[model samples]
Structure formats: structure tokens, C-alpha cells
Target chain A: LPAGCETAILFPMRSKKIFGSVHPVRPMRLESFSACIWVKATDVLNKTILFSYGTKRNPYEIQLYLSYQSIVFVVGGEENKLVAEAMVSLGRWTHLCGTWNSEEGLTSLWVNGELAATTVEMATGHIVPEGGILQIGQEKNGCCVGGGFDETLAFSGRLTGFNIWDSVLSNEEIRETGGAESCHIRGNIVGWGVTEIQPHGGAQYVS
Target chain B: LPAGCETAILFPMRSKKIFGSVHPVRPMRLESFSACIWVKATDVLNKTILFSYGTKRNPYEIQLYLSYQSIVFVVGGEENKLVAEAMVSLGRWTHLCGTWNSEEGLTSLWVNGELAATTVEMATGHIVPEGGILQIGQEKNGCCVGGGFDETLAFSGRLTGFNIWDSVLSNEEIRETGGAESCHIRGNIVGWGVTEIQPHGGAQYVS
Candidate 1:
């Protein structure tokens, strides 16, 4: 007797409001990986990060930033960084997926279901590394200045369905896969549904 | 340590993939109403109906069109119908809401939380009427056999967080409300969280 579904994990952010993050319990050592999530940016201004993992060295992450409203898909260290941006609509739900293979250095950004942007060779000779920090909401060194996660650039939005895969998925797989825990593709490395993601700030379990 | 939340029900639609719908068990009897649903149009080339409710006359509906991709909102019947359009994204989640207030002779259309189109005339003197049909996925008495609820014009996409109110919502309310079922708001006529919506077709329950 219920109407269409409205259940989802809620990540309400912004201002002095509760900030949230996820630091996986174990280290994930995937050289090549694809990460994805469902995000509704309540505010598109002021750089906001959806997912970030890495340190002062080779950092890897996804971000909803740029004054013109673009998403940054980053990987590799500062030098071999495979940074790419896909323009997105602000203040609405967007399924963003970024995949990178350090081997061939093929990276892609899938917006909705279309492969809107890509990179032929960026992290070609680099590797993502075993991992130092894999967190959500804000980068580990986000507050490189004050020595804590930055709240100024903290994301003020809703996020759900976080997932990751150890191998590069084809354009078809990107299109076929909509959101995490959806379609049950079972990401070998980061299947968020069954994984533990430590919450930070005031992040709570929702859906 | 579940990663964020995944309690939301999700509906995956396309072809023979088991779609679903909601039609009130009993007519709420209304003269003015507003309805909205969260949708991700997988395919927009074909004219698609997201939701339609009405009797042989005073029909109200929302549709996806093919003029470089857009949405059509209609009210009233064949000869005297009021229609408007608002362009939208093709392959991403878009919130579509349609409203009609006969008393004020006002009508409106909202896309992604913004009211983008409307009309002040047409069906100004009429009420929405009651006890005909309110359906999703396809229209009821579509053009009464001549057209409407056409199988070829049915939607092939993902839909969620559907809702309806028996009154015209303020622009502030429209922008503030995203998607959900629990929050309570006083709407003398109809409120969703407490009322049950009957499902039809192969449309199974989703988040």
C-alpha cells in the first residue's frame, strides 16, 4: 500500500552542520579501481568533495567542484595525477562514476548513463598504491592548513550507494551499472553494502 | 558498519524488466492538485508518460517528449486542455511536478525543483473532478481508445519518490521538498505518508 520507494542512507552536510566520512576498516590495495555513488548537491558553490582517498603522495578521489560546476576525478600522485572533470547539474541527484586503470592509464567519467568524458592516458605508468586513507565527505589532508579535515570545503549534500571495483569496467559496464548495491554487480574490492564505512562528524545511518 | 545507508527502495525499469504503478484505492475528490515524482529517463526518444490521472474530461498528466528532449505537462480535456513544456536532462534523475488550481485559474510545471512553465487560462473555470483514474507508467482512458496510455508511448526508465498533494504548493515548498514519505506537512486535502497508494501493472514495490 506504500507509494514508490524513498528509503536511502542520508548524508546531510554543509555549514557547521554535521560533517560525515567513511574510513574502511581494512586497507584496500587495488592498483586499478572504479568508484561510484549517488549524490544530490545541495550547494554547488565552494569546492565540495564526494569521495577522497590518499595522502600527500599519490592521492585518488572524486570531487564536485570548479566554479562552472564540474566534477574532478583524480588519481595518481601530483605528477601523474589522472585528473578529469565532467560537468553536472547542481542541486539535483546525479549518479557519478569514475574509473581508472593505471596500467593502460585509461580513465573515464560516466554521467547518468552516458560516457560524457574520458582520458586516453593519464596514470599510464603509475599505481594507486595499497592505501593510506580512504575517506568520504572530506579528504584526509583536506585541512592541510589546520591539520584536520576542512569544513570550509566540506560537502553540503546527500550521498548514497557508494561502491568500488578493483578492475576497469567497460563503457557498457558503466552504462549498465547505475548505483552501488544496485544490479548486484558485486564490486570485488568495495561493495559498500557489505563493507564498513566509519562515519565522521555527525554522519548518521539513513535511507 | 554499513557504509552510509541503503534502506531506500529502488525501481529498475526498461522493457520487460517488471515495472510498477500507483492508483488511489478511492478517489480523494479534488478540484486542485499537485503531483510529483523523481525520474531518470533512460530513453527519451519515444513519447513517454510518467504519470496521468483524470476522467474522460479534466484529464491531468506529465510526459517526456522528443524535441531535442523535453517534458510536457497537460491538464483538462481534448478541446479545452491546457498544456505547457519544460526542457530537461535525458539520462539523469529529474524531478517533475505538475500543479493546477482551478480557483485561481493557475497551472504550473516544475523540473528539478524549479517551476519552469505554467498557464493562467484554460480550464480556469473547471475543477479536476473525481473518480476517473490516476495512474503511473501509462494513462487511463488515454484519449479514450483513440489515443493515450498508448503502449508505444509508455515510459521506459527509472522512477521513484512519487507523491501528490491536493493543493498548489508554494515555490518555496516545491524547492524545499525533494523526495520522501515520512515528513509531515499539513495539506487539508491529501497527505501521502499516512495514506496508502494502490499499485498496478507488474509494478512491484521499490524504495
Candidate 2:
């Protein structure tokens, strides 16, 4: 985001297709994690992707999809794709969070600071794989290195305030993903500052 | 969005600290996946978690904490870590995408359509774990598997257009998460189209 504008990059979805991604300076060497991002729907009924992530081969992913009816968070891949549905406002800002645990064998999401959806069944022997990169705004391509993209799935709104953590957060941290100072208290892995970012594609800075 | 555009219920984090979540109508049966989303940072530059997923036994997560130096995507647990980084605009809505394939031993991230950072080493041998739930706006709180969370990382922003696929996409698909007929072509597992949703806290809906 640029300077002082409540910055957000806009996506018309139709012709103004745009996207952005980040590659960690390190390796995904953990067994579980927590992801967070801010979003709004230009056309919540259009089944737009707020953001998706996972490996190329196993497709271990948790993604947010919108329907005119409600917003849903989907996780896993192939036979394990678990869907968690929740309510969200159209064309507005809100926080979305999710977690994947291998030890307990479960995956879950939180809308704002409350527990929205979770895999009650996966709560026992699941384990996160080791290795691979993380992408935002788009899914993995055919080559496994990052390439293929679907325009229909392109975003249509503004995006900002993105973060990830190795350790799972409790009720308070999830609610604090947007605050300050002590907000940085729970991070056990990589925490990036906005200055280190590199913009690409149709992405423009606003603030 | 017409002003009094007051159609949506306010999920005020300050007072109610309410949130949302989605539970799959189906299951995440795939092994690998590509996720995407459109976001606007109304609360940029904080420890706010836009969203998170995973379980208690084995926590896997993605978190967004706004730092002026860079943007960080944290994934993993107390033992291991995988972090993707990039610098981006602070207040604008931007398209964010991410991908990971354990079998392909590949993990990558993107900002817009360009390559921000990637693991040239994490390819050809990676493997994603099996099974879990999908969640939004919150993290795994308390003991179940991976770990717990604090309230400091909650996210605040307008979010929309979220989508995910069983596999990863490159170039074209990354630019857009959805569009016409074929965009759905990439989705092989659980995909929901507008359904009933429930809201907690102070959240409401608007057009």
C-alpha cells in the first residue's frame, strides 16, 4: 500500500485482472501454521477467490470462496477437501484466519476473532507436509513452480495487511492481527515489514 | 455500493470482537491445492491476521502482519518454520496468491504476476499432509494438536472474491482466480456456490 490512503489495490475482475504473491526468505519447515489476510468482495456471488495456498502434488490447500448466499473456507485436497462455511458482508473489509495441524490431525478457520469453521473429523492424526513455497492471490501452476492462472478467478477489490505465523494463535491474537506493538507478541516464525515487499503485475500501491 | 450502503452489519472488533467461519459442506479430498483471494487493508500495518486455517494437534497456518519493512507469510509450528516475504502497498486492495506442492518439492509466492521469491531448492520431493478443516479470520486456540493463539493478530479489512483449486496454476490463472466457464475447470474437489451463512458478534450484510 502507498502512503496514507487506507491503501488497497483494486481488481475489476473483468478487464482489470491483477494479482500479487510472496516467497519466503526461508523454507516451510514446520508441521503446522496460521494464515491471515484482509478482504472484501466486489461480487461475492461470483465465487471469487480471496486467496489460495498449498503444494502442487498433494494440493494441501485452504481457500476462501464466495457465493451470493455466504462465504466459505475450503481446505485439503483431492478426497480431503473440507469445506467450512460462514457469513460475511459483501464489499467490505474483514479479517480471515485459518490453521493446519498435523499432530491433532485437524484444520480450522476464524472469521475476525471468532471460530468460524473447523474440521471436527480431522482433529486427530493429521500432519502438515514438509517443504514447498507459499503463494498469494493465485494458486499453483501446472509446472509446480508457479504459472497457470484463471482470469475468472481473478480478484475484484482492494487487498492489504497480509501475514502468516508458525505457531497457532489463541482468541486474543486472532483479534489482534490488526492492532499494534504487543500484536507482534505471538509470532514464532517469520514476520515481514511492509518495506521489504516487491510489487508485480497490475498491482499498484495506495495509502 | 450506495452510501447509507449501510446494508452490512458491523463486525466492530473494538466492542464485540465478532468474527465468521466456514465449514465444508463436503470434504477436502485432494492432496495439493492452489488458493487465491482479493483483499483491501482497511487496517494495514498491524499484526492483524487476515485469515488462518489448520488444527490443534498439527497446526498449519498463514498470517499477515503489516510491517513497514516487508510483508510476511508465516507457516509451520513451534519446531519448524517456512516464511515467504515481499514488500507491498500498505492500504490498497491487491490480488494475493500462493502455491505449495510437497511431491513436487516446490513452494512459491507471487505479488501480482511477477515472481517475488521462491524455493529453487524445495522442489521434486515435497509432500503435503493429509486431512483437516478450513477456517477464516482466526487461528487454532488452545490445545488440540499444533498449539494455541493470542488475540493480537486479528485482521480488519474489506474482503471478497476468494477461490481455491485442487492443483496449482501458473501465469494466466495467477492473474485471476475466477471468470467464465473454464475457470472452474481447475477445481476438482469441494467447491460451493452461494449458500446459507450465519454471523456472530456484530457482523451484518450489505449490497
Candidate 3:
């Protein structure tokens, strides 16, 4: 909270229903995207869905999660996982960012403003269709709205400044967010405190 | 040849043997790479082989060429091509850089120190094996040595500062080389002016 952040949502336990639905400002059909969030994990599990957006046809149109000792950015499905080594520690706040460009199928992972991992062969030329449900800490079961609760993969953490941009931000732009307030650096698609997020099943906003 | 460059190689016409062979300082099996060059074209053709590295088995292990007002970075074969719109103008010098990372399969094209284009699905997890022939302006005939010359796709331009790095340089690093002397900003894999490049046919070094 030192970087001028006002609030954070806390998931106290790993409950199947403990999650939040992030309502986007508008319908999103993203060809490229950049997202960042601050997280303090109470438990570092093998697999935890931090964020996901799903449509009726594809449950995982876009998903960001922690897997084993890596952080993965999934598009469409598991076949296109852009993975990078993990740098997260337990009980400590870490700034994490992920970027994807469909034109180049380029995926980049940034930890604390520096490029942590990168690759060129991700889900290239793929589009994340509009009219999908976007959620935090859980994934949508069949896509229309929500309800495929999985306790085993729910995130147990304190999250803040969760932002998503329609376009991939430059390296300098990503670094500029490191010391700025959550409200100061707003994402075009989904701003942290600017956008409305409904908490469910024990997930609560904390200041 | 501004930007503190000392010399450039000029290809007068489209000749089969009017190319240069660039010998690497050491055997290179690149998992990731970054390369840059300065080019001034007399004519702009739809497809011209600006740079290429080929082996006996795969004549196009790595290739950078101009295609239909677009710049393309190819690896393995024709299946994996990372393309971006061209910023190259006729009769003007332009700085061009191409980077590829095997992990995550990321490709980037930088023109005049700015990112011109990018892609992620370019030869993911594929390693350009060692013992390939590296040539400038033309592709190799086979795996062993340089003899497969395509006059139609031959480059008709002046080139300088053709440098290669084993690792992908940061955006800032690439920008730094834009104004520095080619001799000062040496590449680890293949430094311009520092490395040996044998000129053949009508290709000659000019100051």
C-alpha cells in the first residue's frame, strides 16, 4: 500500500465461492492487452487462477494464474500458455504485470517494473472475443456469467491495483506504474478502483 | 553513413554471386538473438533477401528480408514468419533491428530505435542449429557453403553496422546503439567492423 494504493481485496481462505467478478467498462474484443496487479499471497499454491475471462464457447479465453514454479498467461486454452519463472514470495507484496500482443503472439512477464520473462510463440493472431465474463480469483464454468467454483485453484491473497489495458504498454509505461497510485495509473479496459467489482463468498474489500 | 558509422557494403546490381558472407566470431546456437543494421536502398522491391543464414539441411534457419512493403523475420522455414509493416524508405538510411527469443517465442522489429512491429508465434522452442552459413544479401545454396544464389531476390542497397547479439537487448539498449559508433557498440555474437565479412562478386566496402 506504500505506492499510494487506497484499497485491496482480501480473500481470507481458499473457498470455491470466494471470488469477485470484475465488470468491464465496455465490451472487450482484445487483440492485445496489458494487465498488472499487486498481490500479497497468504498461501502460494501450485495452481491459482488470479484472473480470467471466459466466453460461452471457450471457458478460458484469457487467464492468468500461478502454476508450480511459474506464472502462466493462457489464451483460448492450455495449448497457448506463455510461461515465466516465478518470483513471488509468501506474505509479501509483489507487483506483477503481463502483456500479450496478438499481432506478434508475443508474451512478456514483468516483475517489479523489470522484464522477468518473455517469449515470441504464444497465441498469435488470436482474438479474445467480446461478450465474455471476466472474474478475479476464480474462473467461469461455462461462460455466460459465472459459477464453476474450484476451491483447489482459488487464489488466497490480498490483491490491489488490478488493471487491464486494451493495448500493450511500453516498458517505460509499465515502469511508471511502479511508484504511482492505483488511481493515478488507470487501465483503459479495467481500472482498479474506477471500475466496479462485486465481491462474493467471503471476499471483501479492505483498506 | 551517419551515426558514427565508418563503412558500408554496396551491392551494385542483382547478381547471383554479388553477396557477402559474414563469418561469426564463434559457433553460435542461438536460443535468443538481437541484430541491427543500417540500410539505404536504391530500389524498393516486393521481396528482397537482405540477410540470411542457412544450413545444408535448412537453407533458411534464420532470414531477414523485405516482402511487399513489410519486413519479415523468418526462422526454421516459411511456416514461421514474424512480419511488421515496413518503415524503410528508398534512398534514405534507416536503422533496423530484429530480435527473437525462443522462450515464449517473441519477435520484435525496431526501426530507428522504436518498435515498428512484433509477433509471438515465431519458431517457438526451435533452435537454429550450429554450423550454418551466414550471408548478407543472398541465401546459401545448401548446408555446407554459400552457392545458392537467387538473383531476383538479391538486395540492391548499401548496408552497414550489421551486428548480432546472442541475447535479446533491452529497448533502451537497442536505442543506445542508434547513435553510437558501430565499432563502439559491438555485438557479442557478431560485431560490425570487428568481425570478418568476406565480400564477393560486385559487393564492395564503401566509406
Candidate 4:
């Protein structure tokens, strides 16, 4: 069954916060998945959203990297992979979303609910199966993700109404929620780490 | 025969000096002539050099109007009359020379030795005969010239080293005099005028 979790309580933590195991659940073959978020940060050097679904050496990881005024999606196992990218203005809240399906191939990327990019690969080398832990804010190896960001790409702005799905979400559903939630079993939820992260006034710690 | 007079001063001596008078010897049938000067006045509206050979009612007047940043030439006369006009940047000292020969039936304008504008005519107009008054710094009626200047156009600047001739000057001759000496007269020298009005510096004088 698809996960019906809509809004997860974001960790109110300001800096780096890790949640959930770094593995997937049951090696579940994902047919499709979607992600969307609005971010605004003064330090964007290492700002990123990391998804690791396998062992660190050969994990099916994807990263959403943000710089001063651009965002890029990187997929694959270290050296070998297909890179798809796009850019958006800085300092302004914007919606970014991507989807992929084994049967229909890699679907497309949508920025602000409009189709921005697409591809037709019969099979992507990196697919998250059943039992992989889905972590959001921090990267694997437990190191703080850093790039154009100063110390790390710790999200410094507000992240709200996040969602994910084990199955591909319909365009209508994606549009209705504004790409805020996912339907993937254990597939979607709120809260970054096991600890509760509050969602008011810019990610407050829920301790 | 050509004009034997060395210089025909235009405006009479006053606080604002403009010296120009028609040739006293030969009928100055201009093949080409050059006018040069440095103007100092914030108001370009009242400064200009006019060439009027045709009769008063249907005269062909060629005027070189100056402003702080630009110079423009205006021509008005009967339908059969020829008109040639051009302009160059203002402020710094510059040379404006022009030529009109009966054989070629063409009027060519030049600025600083560079060809600017030209016109063609099958017949040449009346020539400046000996004893004809070549007044300067003032209008045909001998009244101080006014109007035709604005914020976008001002001639508050100084003018010096002006000269005129009865024949088209060779490029070599133009370079020899260091470009139109004040009151210098030769076989070709016919009429001349000079003024001191610095507009950019905000100085204006009336004579």
C-alpha cells in the first residue's frame, strides 16, 4: 500500500539535523517518486537535500544541490551516471519537483508545477528498493553536506508540507498538494530525524 | 576674379564680438570654406554662423548652431536651392568645413577633416559679391541671434580660430594652417568670425 503521510513535522533545529536510518525498507522496487520544497538561505554554498538508499560505497543516492542562484540534480554511483540540471532565481521561494518510474522510465522534472526537463531511460542504474533509510537534510557518512555553503548546506530557511510516495503520483495529485507530500509507503512522512522538528517560524527544535 | 580681401569680419566689436563682412575685391564664389571656433556660453540658443547668399525673401541660409554637447546645421531656401548640413560633438575645439563646386553641382559638409553630409544641385545659387556685408554673431537683420537651444542643447562655450575661403581647400592646405586660423586671409580666405562663450562653465555675455 502507498504511504498516505501528508505533512511531517520538520525538525525545528537550525543547523544540521539527521533523522531515520540510512537504509531503505524491504528493497521495495520504486515505480515512481516526487519531491518538492521551498528554500531561502543566505549561505547556499553546501545547501542540499540528500537521499541515500544503499551502502555508502555503492548507494543509490541523489542530491539536490543549491548555490547562490541555481539548483542541480545529481544522480548515479559516484563517477558513473546521468546528470540533469536547471536553475531558478535566488532569495525567492520556488517549487522544485522530480519523478521517476521503472516502467515509464525516468519521468520528468517540474519547477513550480510546470514541466522543466524530461528523459526516457529504460532503466536508471540507481533505484531505491524496499528497506533503505530516507534521510533529508544531511548527507551520508554523517558528514555535514557543504559546498557553496559556508560550514555546511544546512537549510537556513523554512521547509514546509513535505511529502513522498512509493508509487508515481498523478499530475492532479501533485498539483493539488502543490508537491508538498508523497504517497510512497514508509514512503512518506514528516520530521527530519527521530527527534520532532517544529514547523513554525523557521524550523524550531521540538524538544 | 577672386576676392582680394584677406578677411571679411562678421559681427561688429562689442562685449560679444562677431566679425564677418563680404569680400571687398573679387566676387567670393565659394567652392568650399571652413569655419572653426571655441564657444563659451551656457546658452547655445543664441550662437551660430550663417551663410546667406540668396536674396532676403527667398534666401538660402546655412546655419551652424552649437550647444554644449552637439552642433547642428540648418538650411532653408527656395525649392531650387541646395542645402547641406551636418554636426559634431561640442565643448572641445573642432573644425567644420564644407565645399560646393559648380562643376560637380554638389555640396559636401565635413567635420574635423572627415566628410559628414553632402547634397547635389544642378545649378549654383548667387555668389557673395564684393562689398556684400558678412555679419557674424548676429542674425540677417543684424540683431543678436536667439532661440534654438535648450537643456538638451546649450552653447555656453568659447570659439576661436575661424576662417573662410572662396575655393575648395585641399586636405594639405587644411592641415597647414593648423585648421582655420582666426582672421587669416589668403587667395581663398573670404570671411571669418570668433567668439568667447563657455556654456558648460556657465558663462554667457551679450554684445
Candidate 5:
């Protein structure tokens, strides 16, 4: 990951089965965490496509995916894994959020201000490796696509205002994002830039 | 109009039909309005309808309607009309509202919190006529609905949340009522009992 980089773009696949990018910023360490974004999927075939960030080498970083069945959040180390799922519909603009805090562990998932799912887990610390290139659209070297996408997992969509914080977000914060506006204040680690290198173009250094 | 009733229902014509009932409380100045309702129509035909109060008989009254081509609001003898030709889609729930105040004029027409239109026509002193019968499903004296609807401009779909108010409402207040909850504010009218009053029911009060 680039040092002091706030945002970056990653195009993570070979062959043009889909078009998208990802950005890996410096991994942050925290007792609690949350991520959010506004997404619109136009003519999506299945639900199993997403934007992700984590160590390229680590098996357990963080992966967020939207599938026909649900919104999936995966977090764990190489030996163990924890996953949360929230049902989401297709073809509309929706605010999707996932959060974890000390008091409640993994609190819940939110879509359009309504709580979709909730759970409690052990407070686990997450880390981003230094000097790793933040991959965007595709995963690093296409290793099983975070446990494979659903039958309709390829995404044909638009994503905007993606954000992640070292701390968990409140219900009000999620609602504000769900509204027509947002007030996320943190700077991105990778920063916002188009990933010029395609996965098919051969995996070079993703900036 | 039936005297001292609690609820009223109205189904406007396919083109420019109207239906209204009187308030049970005399000089019923409203403070809030809410409803559990859905409004729908058959076909892609375009038309306007209204949910209104006040007449030549009661000049200081409120009148609201979804017209053949727009939404019209009349308060304290002033009129404000908003056109939403393509806004009201077929087979959907449309929650609408109108609030009047001396300082703000009028706040009218919110479909799912995406404000369709607003106007300032300040005139606030008025009261809903007391002792008026709440007509359930059709206009005054049943004349507004042609031949029990066959002879008149009959409404082809369903209407729920047929509610009325003696006062104005805030934006948050309007949203709370628009959901799947029962509104309990006093003097607020609702149509829960008459769930399926047919368009061509051949009952007549005059005979």
C-alpha cells in the first residue's frame, strides 16, 4: 500500500467479463470499524459483485460484496472467518452499511435507514499491510473471488461516495448517508483515481 | 353528510371526479393529519384528482385534490396548483399532504419525501365544518360518482389512508403517518372499516 495515500483505484481482473476498479489504502487498526457507499446497479445479472480493500497477501482482510441473495461482509484471519449477510434489492440506488463496535461487536447492517440484520462478535483488530497495492475492481490475482460469487454475481453497476472509518458509525450517520446527502469527514488512504491497469492487461504495480 | 362521524372515504373519477365528507367536530380547525393508505389507477391514462375541504357553503375551509393533470391546493380562499403529469405511476402507493400557515403560505405535495412541489400562499384562519357526515367512498350526495359510478366518472382502483386534518403538519409529522402505522391524533379521519366499498354499490340516501 502507498504510504500516506488517501485513495487509489484498482482494476482487478483479466479479460473484460466486467468493468470496475478498487483502491487499497493504508490498512487502519481499530477496535471498531464501518464502511459505506451509494451504489446503483444497472441491469445486473446476479448479486455477487463488490468493491473491497485489505492485504493482497493476507487471506483474511476485508471483502464487501453485493449478491442476488444478500450483501455479504467477510472479516477473519487465515485460520477462521466471520461473515454477515443482509438482503438487498436490485435496480435502485441504496445506501448499504456495515459496522462493528466494542460494546456490541458487530451491530447490524442498514439499507435505506432500516436495520436489515444484527449480530454480536468478538472485537477483532484489522490490519492493512504496508507497501501493498490497493486493488480495486478485481481481487489480487483472482484468488477464488472472496469465496466465489453467486450464480448472478457479476456486477454491472455504478458506485460512489465509498467510505471507511476506523470507528463504528451510529444509526444517525447511516441515515444521513441514506438521505440525499452525506457528511463523511475522513480522508481516503488510496485517494480517488481511476485504475488504469486492467486485470487482463497483466498485474502490474496498481497505483 | 353524516353528522358527528369519525371517518370518511373518497374515490375520485378517472378524469376530473371529486368526493368529500364533513368533519364530526364543528369548526374543526386541524392541528395534524395522517393516514395508512395507497392510491392507484388502472391504465397509463393521465388525469388529476383532489382531496379537499371547504365549499361556497364554507368559504374559510381547506380543499385538496389530485387533478386530471396536477395537484391543486386551496386554503383560506387562495389557490395553489402543482403539475405532476408523470409523477403518479400506476399501481403504486402515493402519500400526499398540504400544510398551511400565515408565514409559509402552503407546503403541498410530497411523494415519498421527494418534494414534488411547494408554494407560499399565506392564509391560515379556517376551521373544518362541524357535524358533517363523513362520506365513505364517493362525492357529496353520491352525485359526483355517476350512476353509482357507471353513469359517473368512477374510480377504478383502491384508496386507503383516506384521512383529514383540523390543523397543519410538519415534514417529519407527514412522514410518520405515511408509513405502515396507525395515526392516533384526535379529529384525524381514517377509512379502515370500509376496506372494500365497491364503485357501483347501488345504495342511495335520497330514496
Candidate 6:
């Protein structure tokens, strides 16, 4: 197929060790960036972990979650978190995207190619450093690492076309290339198909 | 009548001049406080001003608005604003309350006697000073303040039982005194009936 077939990583149930780890081809020390993914959630809990990227020192440096009928995008720490009011539907594929800039600290959330919420109080002039662990489905807590995953905060869903860009995509660009064709929307930092995502426990990659 | 009488101030349409002014019986300088009101909105615009209290220096000291299907309760300023995600129904009476404490900076929003939203980043250790003007429906801007009211930001609604307390009322106390009987739930700082509200322009008081 010219557009390439759709491939998804499925987390059938929430578990302590069930997760997928991504090793980016390039380092990801960023001052500003945009991340997008397609997810079909089976359970939306109080703190459902979606994408968690953190260093050993700060376990919640950059994290995203569907918590209490809202999408909270956290960067640097909790003091610079942006809460996007959303009611993500269960068992439905929804494209979720978050963009942030260190200059103005403006953070925006996009759902299904539409701008949902925005705030200008996120971590300004903050640079997300490299050498961090990036994982999906389950999270890692601080200090003395190696799996501090909580079963209660695990993700239960199907995720695919997870990509990240070094710069914030324009509204028109985001709407045009919204995870429909994975190859067409290649991320400079972490390309979905090109990047190696190692599955752990029962989390499996499906085609 | 056993419950005294139900009185309301009606702002039939958006206007620059029409508003209701409140003259508190006592001083309103506070460290912690709670304010409640019963409102039936006829129109909910982008920034429908519900309650606006300001000094000559800061026009947006304490404000409440219904913007984009959310209840924005602002204290001190925009930096200390807590956005409560709510879809305020038009033409139906809704009970709205906001409680703030300068100790922990915990700001909570109550809709229809239920705790709808909360945030701890709202104006911590900030004291709202005295000698401020309080108004409903129209706003006064800063510096040489006469009237900076914009008709677009005006409110069209029926408001009653607008009360304020110097202390943060307990949840049970708030639930008990939820603006049903105006006399039963009297505010120490600004009472609904005791405090004289002067109607201006086309804003009228109805019994």
C-alpha cells in the first residue's frame, strides 16, 4: 500500500509490568516540541498514564494523562502543568496532540485536529533534558529506578502513530497531517514506525 | 411568607450602563472568604460577567465569568484564576459559589452546592484590600475609573441571593445554607437583603 498499513500497540489490560518503551533514534533535549498520538481507551481512570517521559531525577518531567474527564499535560513539574478540559470517549479512536513553547510558555491541546484548550502558564524557558526514559502504558516513579509501575495508573487501550516534532506544528499543518498516514507525518525526534518500541509483559504490537 | 420573599435583580439585555451596585453593610477586607449567588442566565457570551469586584487600581481583582462552557473564578487576578469546567445552562437557575483561603491558596468552585473544581495556585498569601467597588452586569476599568463597561461583555440574567462571607464556610454548612432561603443564609460581610443594592440604568429589582 502506498500509505502503509495501520499498526497499533495494544495494552489489553492494566498491569504493573505491561508497557512499551521507546528508544528514539536521536536525542530529545527540547526547548519546544509537539507530540501526537492516536488512542482508543477502554478505561479512563483518575490518573490514566498515556505518555510518560522522565529522567531518573524527575519522574514526571514530561507526562500526559486522561484524568477525571480532562487531559493534563505536565512538563518540568506539576507547577507548569496545563489542564485541557476534555471528555475522551471510550472504545473510540481519538487523536490527541499537545504543543508547548518555552519562550511564551504557551501550551495547547488538540483533539481530532481541532484546538480544544490552551494556556500560557506552562514551564517557560525550561529545557527538557536528554537521557530520559520514555514509556507508554505504565509509569516509573522517582529514585532507584527499574519499574515502579503502579497497576492502578496503568493504561488500558490501543495506541498508534505516536510521533513527536521539534517545533510546534501550525493549526493547518496539524489538521492536514493528523495521524491518518503514519509515513506522511514523520516526526523528526521520534518516528512511530522508524523508532524501535520494545514491548514488555503482555503489551503487544498488532498489525 | 414563611421563607420571607424571593427577590431578584433582572438585567433583561446586555448594555454598557445597566448594572447593579452593592453597598456592603460592613467592611470586606478578608484573608479567607466564600461568595455565593443564584443566577438564571438569558445569554452566555464569550465573557459573560457574572460578578465583578475591583479597586481603582485593579478592575479584575475578584471576578466570575461563564466563558466557553466553563466557569472561570478569578481571585486577585488572572494568574490566580481557577477554571472550573462546567456547561452553565441558560434560562435555568444555577447556584454558584467560590471559596478561597490565602493560607494554602486553595480555591474551590461549587456549582449547585457541589464541589465542582479546585486548585491550589490561586493568589496564595494575597489579601484583597478594602475600598473596592462591586457591581453586577457591567465592569469598570482601571485608572481614572468612571465606566469602562463594554456591552459585549455585559451579562443578561436574573440574580438573587448574592452573599459573601469573611470565612470559608464548611462543606456541610454550605450545603445546608445553599441559597434557598435568603434570610436563613446571611453573609457577615455582604448580606443579600440587608446590604442595599442600587440598581442602575435598565437593571431592575423584582419581587
Binned by DockQ into CAPRI classes (incorrect, acceptable, medium, high), candidate 2 is incorrect
With a 3 Å backbone cut-off (N, CA, C), the pairs that clash in candidate 6 are: none
Give candidate 5's error at residue B162 in angstroms.
47
Cα lDDT, all candidates: 0.55, 0.51, 0.74, 0.42, 0.45, 0.74
For model 5, what is the alpha-carbon lDDT of residue A191? 25
Per-residue lDDT of candidate 5, residues B89-162 (tens digit): 66665665555555445555566666666666545343344543333333343344352322232354545445
The chain B TM-scores of all candidates, as shown, are 0.70, 0.69, 0.90, 0.53, 0.58, 0.90
DockQ of every candidate:
0.02, 0.02, 0.01, 0.00, 0.01, 0.01
Total clashes for model 4: 81
Single-chain TM-score of chain A, each candidate: 0.78, 0.74, 0.90, 0.61, 0.62, 0.91
Model 5, A23-92: lDDT tens per residue?
4445455556677655544333333446554554663465666545466665544232234454455435
**Candidate 1 C-alpha lDDT tens digits along A1-207:** 111124435444333333454545456666577777666654454565666766555454334343335666555543433334546664466665677776788777778776656776876776655657666666555432432655555665466667778777776777777743354554656665666665554465544
Model 4 lDDT on a 0 to 1 scale: 0.42
Q: A27-138 in candidate 2: lDDT tens per residue?
A: 6655567767566564543555666667755544556566665656665653554554547665566666777776775667777666677774453464555565454555
Candidate 4: misplaced stretches above 4 Å? A1-29, A50-54, A78-87, A122-127, A142-150, A179-207, B1-207
TM-scores for every predicted model = 0.45, 0.43, 0.47, 0.36, 0.36, 0.48
Evaluated at residue A18, the lDDT of candidate 3 is: 63
Q: Order the candidates by TM-score, highest first — what do you get?
A: 6, 3, 1, 2, 5, 4
Candidate 6 Cα errors over 4 Å, as ranges? A2-4, A141-148, B1-207
Between prediction 3 and prediction 5, the one with superior TM-score is 3
List candidate 1 segments past 4 Å from native.
Answer: A1-7, A15-18, A21-27, A56-67, A78-87, A141-147, A179-185, B1-207
